[PDB]
């Protein structure tokens, strides 16, 4: 498939934003950072796979053409919003449309790819999550999907 | 179970605003309650 040049230009602008060298190549860490910053959702397993593919060359830097190929390969995979809704419904044991904030925090902290608790507090503050009050999964999914 | 800790704490809450309805925080029942609250928090707290 061929990507629209407007999207390609936007991707290049995003790359240049964090490209502290300005050469069109940057470290794989900021590669994943801007990959997430694009709004797409790559698994950390997929992130490590992409990192090792780049490291096979040994450069450690993401050249813009290979970056565009990575963009296309990410465009190949596209999960649906209903899948996220069902995933959140799975954790909605009550099924009342609301989920507990503390238990969701524990789910985030101690399952699978564990992330920092400061990121959990970031979710709490940005999504105006009450510390103990029940939070609707659906509103969170909607304002998450708004992008 | 760690899952039931939230239920216990939520019930303790429900009782405490029940007390708020009668404005009996001065009575001291919460002081009888803290053993249960401490047990629930201990269960909820990570023990690694």
């Amino acid at each position: 498939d061929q990507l629209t040049e407007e999207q390609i230009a936007e991707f290049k602008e995003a790359f240049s934003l964090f490209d502290k060298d300005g050469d069109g190549t940057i470290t794989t860490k900021q590669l994943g950072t801007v990959m997430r910053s694009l709004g797409q959702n790559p698994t950390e397993a997929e992130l490590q796979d992409m990192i090792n593919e780049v490291d096979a060359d040994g450069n450690g830097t993401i050249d813009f053409p290979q970056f565009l190929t990575m963009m296309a390969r990410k465009m190949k995979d596209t999960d649906s919003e209903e899948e996220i809704r069902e995933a959140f419904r799975v954790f909605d044991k009550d099924g009342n449309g609301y989920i507990s904030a503390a238990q969701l925090r524990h789910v985030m902290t101690n399952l699978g790819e564990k992330l920092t608790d400061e990121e959990v507090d970031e979710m709490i503050r940005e999504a105006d999550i009450d510390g103990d009050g029940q939070v609707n999964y659906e509103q969170f999914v909607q304002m998450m999907t708004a992008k | 179970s760690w899952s039931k800790g939230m239920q216990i704490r939520y019930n303790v809450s429900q009782l405490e605003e029940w007390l708020r309805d009668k404005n009996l925080m001065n009575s001291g029942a919460k002081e009888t309650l803290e053993p249960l609250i401490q047990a629930a928090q201990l269960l909820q707290v990570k023990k690694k």
């Binding site: 009342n96 609301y98 | 239920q7 216990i8």
Partner: peptide, 28 residues
């Protein structure tokens, strides 16, 4: 008398019942 009334009540109402946010619940 109050303890006698409440004795079978608590176990079912408090722990056995699953709160949703001979059968007794928190609201009971």
């Amino acid at each position: 008398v109050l303890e006698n009334i409440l004795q079978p009540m608590i176990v079912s109402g408090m722990l056995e019942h699953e709160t949703i946010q001979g059968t007794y619940t928190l609201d009971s």
